């Protein structure tokens, strides 16, 4: 959620400034990392209960 | 400037109409049809804005 708010607020900006670098790229990396983390957690807990 | 603005509008028209064709193909998909296939894996997929 923090990262989503970060990207949203950064999107909120005035006309003559709209740029893109690692900041956006690295934040996207954060989001993807997070999602992969959740999926792996769920699979591990499944094996544990079995 | 007039023609430029037109251009943007028709660009949008084109992409949306392509989407309509795709989702008509979606709609009229029916049980026990031909193109149905077991594809596996790609459900938890979101590259979406």
């Amino acid at each position: 959620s923090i990262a989503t708010d970060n990207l949203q607020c950064r999107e909120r900006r005035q006309h003559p400034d709209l740029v893109r670098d690692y900041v956006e790229v690295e934040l996207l990396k954060e989001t993807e990392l997070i999602r992969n983390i959740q999926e792996l957690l769920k699979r591990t807990i499944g094996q544990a209960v079995d | 400037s007039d023609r430029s603005a037109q251009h943007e509008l028709e660009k949008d028209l084109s992409d949306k109409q392509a989407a309509l064709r795709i989702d008509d193909k979606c709609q009229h998909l029916r049980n026990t049809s031909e193109g149905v296939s077991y594809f596996r894996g790609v459900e938890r997929v979101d590259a979406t804005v």
Partner: peptide, 28 residues
């Protein structure tokens, strides 16, 4: 002129700024 340089800069399998031929360009 500018045409050749924009072609040179934006051609690869990497990213792409939509510096179009004419008309309004992308805000980003």
């Amino acid at each position: 002129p500018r045409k050749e340089y924009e072609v040179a800069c934006n051609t690869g399998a990497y990213t792409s700024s939509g510096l179009a031929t004419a008309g309004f360009r992308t805000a980003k």
